[PDB]
Amino acid sequence: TKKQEDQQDQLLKKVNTYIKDNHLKAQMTAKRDERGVVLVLQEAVLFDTGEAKVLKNAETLLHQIAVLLQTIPNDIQVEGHTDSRNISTYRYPSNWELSAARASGVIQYFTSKEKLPSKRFIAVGYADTKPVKDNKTNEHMKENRRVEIVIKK
Amino acid sequence: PSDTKKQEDQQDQLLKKVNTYIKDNHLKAQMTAKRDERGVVLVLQEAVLFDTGEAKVLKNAETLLHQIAVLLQTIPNDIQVEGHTDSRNISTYRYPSNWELSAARASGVIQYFTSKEKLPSKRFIAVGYADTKPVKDNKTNEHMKENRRVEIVIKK
């Protein structure tokens, strides 16, 4: 356990150096928690509101993330999170479906376009069950709309 | 030493209760149960829940899902619903890939549980595995059929 704090710090340092070197600080942030090292991407850099298709302009960002993931062996868990708003549609009848569609759409890009191996990935949808703070203000809901790319321990 | 055995014995009792529930309610043709390192797992082949390539829960399945919700109501565990496909690459306009179909199927089950059966949202996690976790492999049509499934994981 004492040596796995060192390797988690090494990885977080490597990810933060990659973000610096590639000038990605406005598009993503990285952190460390019990899951491992986590890249957080706000909804606006990947999708339109209430949609789960990866925007053409997000492809460069996901490519740069793929380049990083290609150099490490860890399994990758992509989590989708929504705010608590009801923006239901025919394609996404609830936040469960929307959050799971966003996670799986990111993974579809990583595996089908960037050719990272499917076996490294798990798609996870949390709907609105894991807010950053809450959904009591517009700013709090906006930060709840995110994808988290978890570089698993 | 007795702690490993204690936890494993408790998991044995949980699986026994689930199997007895399946038996007593005459559900053997629709679902099976097993356990592994994740916990105790209910397995539902896709045809008891969905039509082919779709993630809309069938009206037929509402009775089965209600009986499962009654079971889930009696235990406190977190519930992880996993969607699985076989390895055959099919797309569609709404589900461009097995990743999206598998996650939409897990999501659709949870949405039924939380909207229609009123189980609390915070108990659930939706998981999509595409074809990465076969029951055994994809070497035969019958193995591919059993791979198209939803697993409801009663987490440890």
Numbering used by the authors:
A (entry chain A): 84 to 236
B (entry chain B): 81 to 236
Pull text from the paper:
The crystals suitable for X-ray analysis were grown from a solution containing 92 mM NaCl. The crystal structure of Bs-MotS68–242 was determined at 1.89 Å resolution. The asymmetric unit of the crystal contains a Bs-MotS68–242 dimer (Sub-A and Sub-B) related by a pseudo-two-fold symmetry. The N-terminal 15 residues of Sub-A, 12 residues of Sub-B, and C-terminal 6 residues of both subunits were not modeled because of poor electron density. The overall structure of Bs-MotS68–242 resembles those of St-MotBc and Va-PomBc. Bs-MotS68–242 consists of an N-terminal α-helix (α1) and a single core domain composed of three α-helices (α2, α3, and α4) and five β-strands (β1, β2, β3, β4, and β5), which includes an OmpA-like domain. α1 of Bs-MotS68–242 projected from the core domain as in St-MotBc. A short helix following α1 of St-MotBc and Va-PomBc does not exist in Bs-MotS68–242, and α1 of Bs-MotS68–242 is connected to β1 by a loop composed of five residues. The subunit interface of Bs-MotSc is formed by α3 and β4. β4 forms an inter-subunit hydrogen bond with β4 of the other subunit, forming a ten-stranded inter-subunit β-sheet, and the side chains of α3 interact with those of α3 in the other subunit. However, the helix–helix interaction of Bs-MotS68–242 is hydrophobic, whereas those of St-MotBc and Va-MotBc are hydrophilic. The crystal structures of BsMotS68–242 at 40 mM NaCl/300 mM KCl, 92 mM NaCl, and 300 mM NaCl showed almost an identical dimer structure, indicating that no unfolding occurs at less than 100 mM NaCl.
